[PDB]
Design a protein around this nucleic acid. Structure first.
Ligand SMILES: [K+]
Ligand SMILES: [Mg+2]
Ligand SMILES: [Mg+2]
Ligand SMILES: [Mg+2]
Ligand SMILES: [Mg+2]
Ligand SMILES: [Mg+2]
Ligand SMILES: [Mg+2]
Ligand SMILES: [Mg+2]
Ligand SMILES: [Mg+2]
Ligand SMILES: [Mg+2]
Ligand SMILES: [Mg+2]
Ligand SMILES: [Mg+2]
Ligand SMILES: [Mg+2]
Ligand SMILES: [Mg+2]
Ligand SMILES: [Mg+2]
Ligand SMILES: [Mg+2]
Ligand SMILES: [Mg+2]
Ligand SMILES: [Mg+2]
Ligand SMILES: [Mg+2]
Ligand SMILES: [Mg+2]
Ligand SMILES: [Mg+2]
Ligand SMILES: [Mg+2]
Ligand SMILES: [Mg+2]
Ligand SMILES: [Mg+2]
Ligand SMILES: [Mg+2]
Ligand SMILES: [Mg+2]
Ligand SMILES: [Mg+2]
Ligand SMILES: [Mg+2]
Ligand SMILES: [Mg+2]
Ligand SMILES: [Mg+2]
Ligand SMILES: [Mg+2]
Ligand SMILES: [Mg+2]
Ligand SMILES: [Mg+2]
Ligand SMILES: [Mg+2]
Ligand SMILES: [Mg+2]
Ligand SMILES: [Mg+2]
Ligand SMILES: [Mg+2]
Ligand SMILES: [Mg+2]
Ligand SMILES: [Mg+2]
Ligand SMILES: [Mg+2]
Ligand SMILES: [Mg+2]
Ligand SMILES: [Mg+2]
Ligand SMILES: [Mg+2]
Ligand SMILES: [Mg+2]
Ligand SMILES: [Mg+2]
Ligand SMILES: [Mg+2]
Ligand SMILES: [Mg+2]
Ligand SMILES: [Mg+2]
Ligand SMILES: [Mg+2]
Ligand SMILES: [Mg+2]
Ligand SMILES: [Mg+2]
Ligand SMILES: [Mg+2]
Ligand SMILES: [Mg+2]
Ligand SMILES: [Mg+2]
Ligand SMILES: [Mg+2]
Ligand SMILES: [Mg+2]
Ligand SMILES: [Mg+2]
Ligand SMILES: [Mg+2]
Ligand SMILES: [Mg+2]
Ligand SMILES: [Mg+2]
Ligand SMILES: [Mg+2]
Ligand SMILES: [Mg+2]
Ligand SMILES: [Mg+2]
Ligand SMILES: [Mg+2]
Ligand SMILES: [Mg+2]
Ligand SMILES: [Mg+2]
Ligand SMILES: [Mg+2]
Ligand SMILES: [Mg+2]
Ligand SMILES: [Mg+2]
Ligand SMILES: [Mg+2]
Ligand SMILES: [Mg+2]
Ligand SMILES: [Mg+2]
Ligand SMILES: [Mg+2]
Ligand SMILES: [Mg+2]
Ligand SMILES: [Mg+2]
Ligand SMILES: [Mg+2]
Ligand SMILES: [Mg+2]
Ligand SMILES: [Mg+2]
Ligand SMILES: [Mg+2]
Ligand SMILES: [Mg+2]
Ligand SMILES: [Mg+2]
Ligand SMILES: [Mg+2]
Ligand SMILES: [Mg+2]
Ligand SMILES: [Mg+2]
Ligand SMILES: [Mg+2]
Ligand SMILES: [Mg+2]
Ligand SMILES: [Mg+2]
Ligand SMILES: [Mg+2]
Ligand SMILES: [Mg+2]
Ligand SMILES: [Mg+2]
Ligand SMILES: [Mg+2]
Ligand SMILES: [Mg+2]
Ligand SMILES: [Mg+2]
Ligand SMILES: [Mg+2]
Ligand SMILES: [Mg+2]
Ligand SMILES: [Mg+2]
Ligand SMILES: [Mg+2]
Ligand SMILES: [Mg+2]
Ligand SMILES: [Mg+2]
Ligand SMILES: [Mg+2]
Ligand SMILES: [Mg+2]
Ligand SMILES: [Mg+2]
Ligand SMILES: [Mg+2]
Ligand SMILES: [Mg+2]
Ligand SMILES: [Mg+2]
Ligand SMILES: [Mg+2]
Ligand SMILES: [Mg+2]
Ligand SMILES: [Mg+2]
Ligand SMILES: [Mg+2]
Ligand SMILES: [Mg+2]
Ligand SMILES: [Mg+2]
Ligand SMILES: [Mg+2]
Ligand SMILES: [Mg+2]
Ligand SMILES: [Mg+2]
Ligand SMILES: [Mg+2]
Ligand SMILES: [Mg+2]
Ligand SMILES: [Mg+2]
Ligand SMILES: [Mg+2]
Ligand SMILES: [Mg+2]
Ligand SMILES: [Mg+2]
Ligand SMILES: [Mg+2]
Ligand SMILES: [Mg+2]
Ligand SMILES: [Mg+2]
Ligand SMILES: [Mg+2]
Ligand SMILES: [Mg+2]
Ligand SMILES: [Mg+2]
Ligand SMILES: [Mg+2]
Ligand SMILES: [Mg+2]
Ligand SMILES: [Mg+2]
Ligand SMILES: [Mg+2]
Ligand SMILES: [Mg+2]
Ligand SMILES: [Mg+2]
Ligand SMILES: [Mg+2]
Ligand SMILES: [Mg+2]
Ligand SMILES: [Mg+2]
Ligand SMILES: [Mg+2]
Ligand SMILES: [Mg+2]
Ligand SMILES: [Mg+2]
Ligand SMILES: [Mg+2]
Ligand SMILES: [Mg+2]
Ligand SMILES: [Mg+2]
Ligand SMILES: [Mg+2]
Ligand SMILES: [Mg+2]
Ligand SMILES: [Mg+2]
Ligand SMILES: [Mg+2]
Ligand SMILES: [Mg+2]
Ligand SMILES: [Mg+2]
Ligand SMILES: [Mg+2]
Ligand SMILES: [Mg+2]
Ligand SMILES: [Mg+2]
Ligand SMILES: [Mg+2]
Ligand SMILES: [Mg+2]
Ligand SMILES: [Mg+2]
Ligand SMILES: [Mg+2]
Ligand SMILES: [Mg+2]
Ligand SMILES: [Mg+2]
Ligand SMILES: [Mg+2]
Ligand SMILES: [Mg+2]
Ligand SMILES: [Mg+2]
Ligand SMILES: [Mg+2]
Ligand SMILES: [Mg+2]
Ligand SMILES: [Mg+2]
Ligand SMILES: [Mg+2]
Ligand SMILES: [Mg+2]
Ligand SMILES: [Mg+2]
Ligand SMILES: [Mg+2]
Ligand SMILES: [Mg+2]
Ligand SMILES: [Mg+2]
Ligand SMILES: [Mg+2]
Ligand SMILES: [Mg+2]
Ligand SMILES: [Mg+2]
Ligand SMILES: [Mg+2]
Ligand SMILES: [Mg+2]
Ligand SMILES: [Mg+2]
Ligand SMILES: [Mg+2]
Ligand SMILES: [Mg+2]
Ligand SMILES: [Mg+2]
Ligand SMILES: [Mg+2]
Ligand SMILES: [Mg+2]
Ligand SMILES: [Mg+2]
Ligand SMILES: [Mg+2]
Ligand SMILES: [Mg+2]
Ligand SMILES: [Mg+2]
Ligand SMILES: [Mg+2]
Ligand SMILES: [Mg+2]
Ligand SMILES: [Mg+2]
Ligand SMILES: [Mg+2]
Ligand SMILES: [Mg+2]
Ligand SMILES: [Mg+2]
Ligand SMILES: [Mg+2]
Ligand SMILES: [Mg+2]
Ligand SMILES: [Mg+2]
Ligand SMILES: [Mg+2]
Ligand SMILES: [Mg+2]
Ligand SMILES: [Mg+2]
Ligand SMILES: [Mg+2]
Ligand SMILES: [Mg+2]
Ligand SMILES: [Mg+2]
Ligand SMILES: [Mg+2]
Ligand SMILES: [Mg+2]
Ligand SMILES: [Mg+2]
Ligand SMILES: [Mg+2]
Ligand SMILES: [Mg+2]
Ligand SMILES: [Mg+2]
Ligand SMILES: [Mg+2]
Ligand SMILES: [Mg+2]
Ligand SMILES: [Mg+2]
Ligand SMILES: [Mg+2]
Ligand SMILES: [Mg+2]
Ligand SMILES: [Mg+2]
Ligand SMILES: [Mg+2]
Ligand SMILES: [Mg+2]
Ligand SMILES: [Mg+2]
Ligand SMILES: [Mg+2]
Ligand SMILES: [Mg+2]
Ligand SMILES: [Mg+2]
Ligand SMILES: [Mg+2]
Ligand SMILES: [Mg+2]
Ligand SMILES: [Mg+2]
Ligand SMILES: [Mg+2]
Ligand SMILES: [Mg+2]
Ligand SMILES: [Mg+2]
Ligand SMILES: [Mg+2]
Ligand SMILES: [Mg+2]
Ligand SMILES: [Mg+2]
Ligand SMILES: [Mg+2]
Ligand SMILES: [Mg+2]
Ligand SMILES: [Mg+2]
Ligand SMILES: [Mg+2]
Ligand SMILES: [Mg+2]
Ligand SMILES: [Mg+2]
Ligand SMILES: [Mg+2]
Lengths: 275, 48
RNA sequence: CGCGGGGUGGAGCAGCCUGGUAGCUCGUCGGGCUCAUAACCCGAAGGUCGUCGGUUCAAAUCCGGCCCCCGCAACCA
RNA sequence: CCGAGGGUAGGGCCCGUGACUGGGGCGAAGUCGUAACAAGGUAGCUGUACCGGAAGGUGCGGCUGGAU
RNA sequence: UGGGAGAGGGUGGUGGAAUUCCCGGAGUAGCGGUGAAAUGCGCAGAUACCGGGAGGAACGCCGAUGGCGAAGGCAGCCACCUGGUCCACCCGUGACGCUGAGGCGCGAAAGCGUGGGGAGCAAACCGGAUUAGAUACCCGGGUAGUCCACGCCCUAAACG
RNA sequence: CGAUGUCGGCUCGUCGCAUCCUGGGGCUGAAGAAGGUCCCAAGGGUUGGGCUGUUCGCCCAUUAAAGCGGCACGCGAGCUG
RNA sequence: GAAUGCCGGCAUGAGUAACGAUAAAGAGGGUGAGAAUCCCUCUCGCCGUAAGCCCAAGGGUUCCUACGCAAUGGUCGUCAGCGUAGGGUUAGGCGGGACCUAAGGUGAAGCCGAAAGGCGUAGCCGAAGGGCAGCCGGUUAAUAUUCCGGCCCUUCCCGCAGGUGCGAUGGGGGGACGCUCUAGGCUAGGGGGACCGGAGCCAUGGACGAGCCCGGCCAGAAGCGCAGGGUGGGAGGUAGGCAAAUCCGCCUCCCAACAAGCUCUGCGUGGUGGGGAAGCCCGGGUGACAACCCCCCGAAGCCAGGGAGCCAAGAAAAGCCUCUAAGCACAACCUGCGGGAACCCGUACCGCAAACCGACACAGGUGGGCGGGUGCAAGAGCACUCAGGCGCGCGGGAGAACCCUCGCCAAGGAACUCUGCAAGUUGGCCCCGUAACUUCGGGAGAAGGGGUGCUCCCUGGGGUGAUGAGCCCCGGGGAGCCGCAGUGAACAGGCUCUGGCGACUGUUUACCAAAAACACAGCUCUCUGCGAACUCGUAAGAGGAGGUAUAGGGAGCGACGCUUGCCCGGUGCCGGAAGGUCAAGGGGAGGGGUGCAAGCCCCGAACCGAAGCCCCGGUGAACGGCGGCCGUAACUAUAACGGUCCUAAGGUAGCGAAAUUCCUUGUCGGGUAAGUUCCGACCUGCACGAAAAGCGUAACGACCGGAGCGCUGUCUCGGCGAGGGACCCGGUGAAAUUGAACUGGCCGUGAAGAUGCGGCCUACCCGUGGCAGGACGAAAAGACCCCGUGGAGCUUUACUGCAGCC
RNA sequence: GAGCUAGCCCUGGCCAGGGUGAAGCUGGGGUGAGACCCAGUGGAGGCCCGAACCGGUGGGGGAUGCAAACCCCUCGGAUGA
């Protein structure tokens, strides 16, 4: 439950921080972190290909277990619940009775000291992973693979969850966090429960500097530029769009769909997204 | 004020040096070009 | 003494382009219904088309002048 | 030393007055509608919300101080 | 101490009817709506029928003129937690009572804030008719809102 | 047009006279005082503010009066901007 | 003979400007052909968080000594960073390599591209990061952690001794990490001493004194002492750490637990080795057998990998340790000890500058460490100073105008002016005191005031030590003294009221704009299901992201408060399996050419046939748009109301002469003696209006308006003074410009503004200080403007293409 | 050609001193328990004053300059985008 501040400076009026109250271990497992190469938005040509990125805080990537079927039927104790600056969710440390240690995405409700497990025989309890065909219909899952053995791809961000709606032959039907209706394969692993830290969205950065701490650099309106730069540049004084509102590269940015038509995934999308 | 020439020997050798030249076609052409003209020095003098 | 568009029963509008033919709504007047008034119903009248000049067998219509009305423009230093 | 008071500076309350502005009251015979009183021709009244030249209307909920 | 009736309250579950939407079949010239109509929808296959799916809200008969609560209010069903109240016994304390300026708490609907939800309904708004007009009544649509969580607001024909 | 810097201010003047003041006049619908109107006359003089970039103009307080115009809309190798 | 021609030579301006910070000079004595300028001395002044010192980069002999003075040096030159010559840089321990990785770079595997080439895992390379063993002194003209002296230490090789399952590019541990704040103990560094050592000194009225002046340390192995860092022990099981594993991980018991112990640093002490001032006498020598002690302050440094809090969550790899495998256990490794071995490159000098970057010995620019003392509350601020370093490589005179920086000013006090521009005022600390408004933080240093020095007296609490004295730090009370004045010098806010715009801190047109612009937290729309969309690339491949719809892209608006109406006809976008049109292709009615024919060959109707477009819908925080004429109320006026025309619908709330109002200095009110501005209103808004957002809003602003108080040389209105120039003399000596010139005024003339023509007038020859009216003065082949079938940037429903997408 | 400049990547370094006093924690009051109030402690912040450092607001000088952007006075930021 987000923490407010007192207006002792103009930016503290609205700055709100995470409660951090579920976190139990303040430095990461040394065996499982590794350097995260900051790109700055540059690609292997040294080219800015994503604009307005760079200069954020230093980080170490915590290696996150996006498979779990690695260790069918080996329980593990929930050793701690940790901060991770590389994702919106928190992370949970797991000590396997195997002796091995891993990190997973902390789901909502998970408690220090509880045991979790993975596999067909597993109980339908928060923190457990199963092949999707084995979780009962109506059950709120997360960390869902998109294809079998290819890794947890969907519902990984703080607060999100996919709910199983039904089954069809080798495939089950998932309502994704966007609201689309997709068929995901049966052998695909997911994890019972929703991701934690749902209060994440109520964070109010507060000042420009906060976004600079995140590596998010100032964004520039096309309207503020010149016509060499942007469809929206130029004019004398201010100026309305004067054409369909567009990106700096030409295409139109209001309503123009851009999913590729002949995509093979289409045979597996049932209904486009929500709201 | 701060002017444009700020000498730095490592910057000079890695940029204009012999070995830098030889690694690209345009660089080899420069050397060929300057051996043809009879230049005394094929490359900036830098002390290392 | 810039380029536009307009002027027609009492009011607001057609008809002009594409000559012969003036029309729509309200209003006005007479009769009704009502105790009465409105509304409503039944009928009627009122426009020589801003003015003058030409073309024409014939001009609201086409051309020209004069009058009046509204509109847009008037920039470079 | 204290000291009437004089000066400088900043507050508090009250009164009178002000371009303009808001509604109010009253005023024999103005204009516009017809909301209410009969089931007043959509029962009314109500707190609230939104809307409309104006009475008012509509929604949500409540009351009979509503009729057959 | 033993008992009893109850939509009293809070949380978490869960059941079927219905409307809507979506898919499939079958099927064809209208459906809808009204005082009459039109707007609207329908040969791009609607309506009406069968089967499947999704989601939200309200709980039919029971049901009463009834019950519960200090008031506002409370109605599928299941469990947990919790209040008030009545009765029988005449067992315990021995006036420990009554009211109550302040204070504090609760407080229908509408409304507000941050998220969520959104089937039906429906201020605003749009269109169709009616009409002298019709910023209405009637019809076809339709956003907030109605619903959940937290926090406000504190009103009433909050009435017996 | 192989450049004549372009408004106003400030500074420094200087000339014209179609004279605002001071001097000399005639006429008066000139009693006196005060004006009006034409004539002669350029010697000297012709204020300080409020407003606006302003020139002008209006306004305040005075004055004998608060004149008009020319000098590349006098004067940026004198200043301002 | 002309091309603002090209190259070179030499003129002109001219003995003119200047000679490069206003930190400052004066004398004596040397030297020498020659001296303001070189050397020595005394005097003066300047820097001292530097203008002193030490590193790094960059420079490349500039270093030292001898000999010189043509050029260089803004003058001079005997001097020099200049010329000639000779000499000078010494390392197992400092730095870099023979070690490690970081971004990045390269790149066996592999992938991709007409060629050249682009990618790419491991690996390699890559440092100012990690890792690794030297400290004090002496010596040279010139090198020193390098030579020497003293005391220490590291690696490799071989040998000896004891010990042990030894053994690695493989497993594991460790290395290993942020920001703010901060404890305990030290150290650097500093202040005082009535104590210790010292050549001396008594001046000019006094002092032989507990007098003045000087100086009272540095390094050091083992040990020991202090303070800290780090670290649980044993056993059982074990499927995980890509083989193994006694190691690590996990689970269980037992013991331990603020500890201890073990381990590692810092500091202290410590055998020993060094150093050692003023003054005097010529860098030296003496002082000197120097003394080398006590107390106080005290780090940002050290113990350190310390502690706590916070969110934005904070490199890698080697060295090192441990585990085992191939192997091997005559080995091998560990420990102690002895002997031997220990290479390459750098080292001079400058280094905030005359040796680096700026064409210059250029008022500019240049990263790190040290940076003393006193006072002022503090401090790296300020003033004066120590050590040390300088007086800026032209001077001497004079004492005009004028300019620059600076000081003061009678009376007035913004009357200046576009504007209080500028300059005054105010100014630190302590105390009292402090408004509207507000988002309750603020506004606030609001405003406004009082205090401040010195002396004597009594006294409260700290740190040290001891609990005391001494030292050091915070205070309180009382009595007094002096001046014009007590933050007596230097450093150090003027304040208030009220509007516009932007919430805010930030950002920007290097070099005419810092703003109202950009950004910004926040709000909405929209795209995107992951081999995401989107971006860069022919591609491979990358970014996105080792992310996953609470995420990522795109666009608008821009904290926050209350809000954001109506129009979907037109354009975009979204939906629509029907219909219409629609290319290649399919089809082949039917025509044609040629042949003797069989044949070969050409044309071709109906018809089947995508996307796109047409058509049907939806859609505004999508592009966008949101009316006219006439009538009407019991005074007048004005119309709640009506009539009618057109539209897709006719501007809603709020706000309005406005950063928008043309007419306009609209009108009325306020302020002023007077107000084209300002503030408040009114509304016929030329031409506001709701996310190119509408109306507000505390706080904020080197933004832009208006007013007031304070106070001033801004002004009336100017005066005087100072220094650096201007002036004179000696030294050195430019410049743009320039057809030639023997170059006057008026009134005319003239290509229409004449020194140069006409007529008149005026005028002896030549300079120097000054002023700017002319030479249509200089500068830049006018930027305005036109022209050229000149050019370029930008746009779009101009044309025609291409990428991309379908 | 990114030794100027603009952005990002990696690895280091720097920011005298003074001032304001958020959360939290403790204690006290409060209550059925609370919220909450008080005091102390604490040491937050694109907080405040102000050197270094980074800037360049106004004025003046300079304008064949000391300088092809400098000098003086003044002014902005200075734990942070
Ligand atoms: K122009
Ligand atoms: Mg907050
Ligand atoms: Mg948390
Ligand atoms: Mg690691
Ligand atoms: Mg990367
Ligand atoms: Mg790369
Ligand atoms: Mg880049
Ligand atoms: Mg991009
Ligand atoms: Mg970027
Ligand atoms: Mg994320
Ligand atoms: Mg997290
Ligand atoms: Mg699948
Ligand atoms: Mg947010
Ligand atoms: Mg970050
Ligand atoms: Mg952003
Ligand atoms: Mg932006
Ligand atoms: Mg723009
Ligand atoms: Mg722009
Ligand atoms: Mg470009
Ligand atoms: Mg373009
Ligand atoms: Mg463009
Ligand atoms: Mg545009
Ligand atoms: Mg623009
Ligand atoms: Mg505009
Ligand atoms: Mg613009
Ligand atoms: Mg447009
Ligand atoms: Mg476009
Ligand atoms: Mg979808
Ligand atoms: Mg620069
Ligand atoms: Mg710099
Ligand atoms: Mg540099
Ligand atoms: Mg170098
Ligand atoms: Mg280097
Ligand atoms: Mg380099
Ligand atoms: Mg090279
Ligand atoms: Mg290169
Ligand atoms: Mg080649
Ligand atoms: Mg040669
Ligand atoms: Mg070369
Ligand atoms: Mg017509
Ligand atoms: Mg007719
Ligand atoms: Mg009667
Ligand atoms: Mg009638
Ligand atoms: Mg033009
Ligand atoms: Mg008195
Ligand atoms: Mg009447
Ligand atoms: Mg009625
Ligand atoms: Mg309505
Ligand atoms: Mg039909
Ligand atoms: Mg059909
Ligand atoms: Mg739904
Ligand atoms: Mg009894
Ligand atoms: Mg008793
Ligand atoms: Mg309608
Ligand atoms: Mg009708
Ligand atoms: Mg709705
Ligand atoms: Mg009742
Ligand atoms: Mg010209
Ligand atoms: Mg010329
Ligand atoms: Mg010229
Ligand atoms: Mg008289
Ligand atoms: Mg006369
Ligand atoms: Mg005169
Ligand atoms: Mg005027
Ligand atoms: Mg003239
Ligand atoms: Mg003129
Ligand atoms: Mg003029
Ligand atoms: Mg003119
Ligand atoms: Mg000028
Ligand atoms: Mg001028
Ligand atoms: Mg001139
Ligand atoms: Mg010739
Ligand atoms: Mg030429
Ligand atoms: Mg030439
Ligand atoms: Mg030449
Ligand atoms: Mg020459
Ligand atoms: Mg010559
Ligand atoms: Mg000469
Ligand atoms: Mg001269
Ligand atoms: Mg000169
Ligand atoms: Mg000079
Ligand atoms: Mg100076
Ligand atoms: Mg000076
Ligand atoms: Mg002397
Ligand atoms: Mg001398
Ligand atoms: Mg000699
Ligand atoms: Mg000399
Ligand atoms: Mg000499
Ligand atoms: Mg000298
Ligand atoms: Mg000397
Ligand atoms: Mg050099
Ligand atoms: Mg010489
Ligand atoms: Mg010689
Ligand atoms: Mg010379
Ligand atoms: Mg020189
Ligand atoms: Mg000499
Ligand atoms: Mg050595
Ligand atoms: Mg070797
Ligand atoms: Mg190619
Ligand atoms: Mg080649
Ligand atoms: Mg390399
Ligand atoms: Mg290194
Ligand atoms: Mg590191
Ligand atoms: Mg040593
Ligand atoms: Mg020697
Ligand atoms: Mg030397
Ligand atoms: Mg051993
Ligand atoms: Mg071993
Ligand atoms: Mg670590
Ligand atoms: Mg790490
Ligand atoms: Mg931090
Ligand atoms: Mg001290
Ligand atoms: Mg150490
Ligand atoms: Mg001796
Ligand atoms: Mg530091
Ligand atoms: Mg440390
Ligand atoms: Mg690595
Ligand atoms: Mg053997
Ligand atoms: Mg070797
Ligand atoms: Mg050396
Ligand atoms: Mg400097
Ligand atoms: Mg030097
Ligand atoms: Mg240069
Ligand atoms: Mg010099
Ligand atoms: Mg001080
Ligand atoms: Mg000097
Ligand atoms: Mg100097
Ligand atoms: Mg003189
Ligand atoms: Mg003075
Ligand atoms: Mg005065
Ligand atoms: Mg005054
Ligand atoms: Mg005064
Ligand atoms: Mg004034
Ligand atoms: Mg002003
Ligand atoms: Mg100004
Ligand atoms: Mg002052
Ligand atoms: Mg002061
Ligand atoms: Mg006030
Ligand atoms: Mg206050
Ligand atoms: Mg205010
Ligand atoms: Mg307050
Ligand atoms: Mg507060
Ligand atoms: Mg204060
Ligand atoms: Mg004060
Ligand atoms: Mg004194
Ligand atoms: Mg200040
Ligand atoms: Mg701003
Ligand atoms: Mg701004
Ligand atoms: Mg705001
Ligand atoms: Mg705002
Ligand atoms: Mg600029
Ligand atoms: Mg420019
Ligand atoms: Mg420039
Ligand atoms: Mg600024
Ligand atoms: Mg600006
Ligand atoms: Mg900007
Ligand atoms: Mg902003
Ligand atoms: Mg906002
Ligand atoms: Mg949204
Ligand atoms: Mg591309
Ligand atoms: Mg491409
Ligand atoms: Mg990645
Ligand atoms: Mg903002
Ligand atoms: Mg407010
Ligand atoms: Mg539309
Ligand atoms: Mg449409
Ligand atoms: Mg449309
Ligand atoms: Mg084809
Ligand atoms: Mg098609
Ligand atoms: Mg448009
Ligand atoms: Mg339109
Ligand atoms: Mg509204
Ligand atoms: Mg107005
Ligand atoms: Mg306005
Ligand atoms: Mg404006
Ligand atoms: Mg306007
Ligand atoms: Mg105006
Ligand atoms: Mg005007
Ligand atoms: Mg006026
Ligand atoms: Mg008006
Ligand atoms: Mg817009
Ligand atoms: Mg606009
Ligand atoms: Mg405001
Ligand atoms: Mg404000
Ligand atoms: Mg600002
Ligand atoms: Mg500003
Ligand atoms: Mg004023
Ligand atoms: Mg003066
Ligand atoms: Mg003389
Ligand atoms: Mg001379
Ligand atoms: Mg010379
Ligand atoms: Mg000649
Ligand atoms: Mg001649
Ligand atoms: Mg002459
Ligand atoms: Mg004459
Ligand atoms: Mg003429
Ligand atoms: Mg003439
Ligand atoms: Mg002449
Ligand atoms: Mg002649
Ligand atoms: Mg002649
Ligand atoms: Mg002549
Ligand atoms: Mg003549
Ligand atoms: Mg002169
Ligand atoms: Mg002249
Ligand atoms: Mg002049
Ligand atoms: Mg001239
Ligand atoms: Mg000329
Ligand atoms: Mg001239
Ligand atoms: Mg001139
Ligand atoms: Mg040319
Ligand atoms: Mg030209
Ligand atoms: Mg030119
Ligand atoms: Mg022209
Ligand atoms: Mg042409
Ligand atoms: Mg032509
Ligand atoms: Mg052309
Ligand atoms: Mg072009
Ligand atoms: Mg161009
Ligand atoms: Mg695309
Ligand atoms: Mg650079
Ligand atoms: Mg460089
Ligand atoms: Mg700092
Ligand atoms: Mg600071
Ligand atoms: Mg304080
Ligand atoms: Mg405190
Ligand atoms: Mg705490
Ligand atoms: Mg302060
Ligand atoms: Mg500040
Ligand atoms: Mg100034
Ligand atoms: Mg200064
Ligand atoms: Mg700042
Ligand atoms: Mg500051």
């Amino acid at each position: 439950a987000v923490k407010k501040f007192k207006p002792y400076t103009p930016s503290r009026r609205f700055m709100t921080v995470a409660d951090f109250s579920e976190i139990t271990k303040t430095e990461p497992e040394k065996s499982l972190v590794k350097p995260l190469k900051k790109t700055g938005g540059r690609n292997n040509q040294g080219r800015i290909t994503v604009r307005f990125r760079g200069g954020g805080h230093k980080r170490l990537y915590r290696i996150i277990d996006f498979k779990r079927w690695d260790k069918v039927g080996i329980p593990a104790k929930v050793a701690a619940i940790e901060y991770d600056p590389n994702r919106s969710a928190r992370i949970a440390l797991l000590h396997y009775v195997d002796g091995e240690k891993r990190y997973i995405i902390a789901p909502d409700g998970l408690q220090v000291g509880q045991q979790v497990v993975a596999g067909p025989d597993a109980p339908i309890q928060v923190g457990n992973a199963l092949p999707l065909r084995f979780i009962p219909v109506g059950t709120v899952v997360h960390a869902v693979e998109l294809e079998p053995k290819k890794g947890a791809k969907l519902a990984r961000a703080a607060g999100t969850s996919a709910q199983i709606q039904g089954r069809e032959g080798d495939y089950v039907i998932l309502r994704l966090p966007s609201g689309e209706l997709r068929k995901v394969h049966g052998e695909c692993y997911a994890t019972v429960g929703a991701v934690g830290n749902a209060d994440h969205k109520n964070i109010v950065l507060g000042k420009a500097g906060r976004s600079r701490w995140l590596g998010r650099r100032p964004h520039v309106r096309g309207a503020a530029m010149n016509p060499v730069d942007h469809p929206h540049g130029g004019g004398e004084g201010r100026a309305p769009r004067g054409r369909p509102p567009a990106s700096p590269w030409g295409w139109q940015t209001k309503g123009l769909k851009t999913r590729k038509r002949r995509k093979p995934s289409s045979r597996f999308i049932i209904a486009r997204r929500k709201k | 004020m701060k002017r444009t020439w700020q000498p730095n020997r490592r910057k000079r050798a890695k940029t204009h040096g012999f070995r830098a030249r030889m690694r690209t076609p345009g660089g080899r052409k420069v050397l060929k070009r300057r051996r043809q003209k009879g230049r005394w020095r094929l490359t900036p003098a830098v002390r290392k």
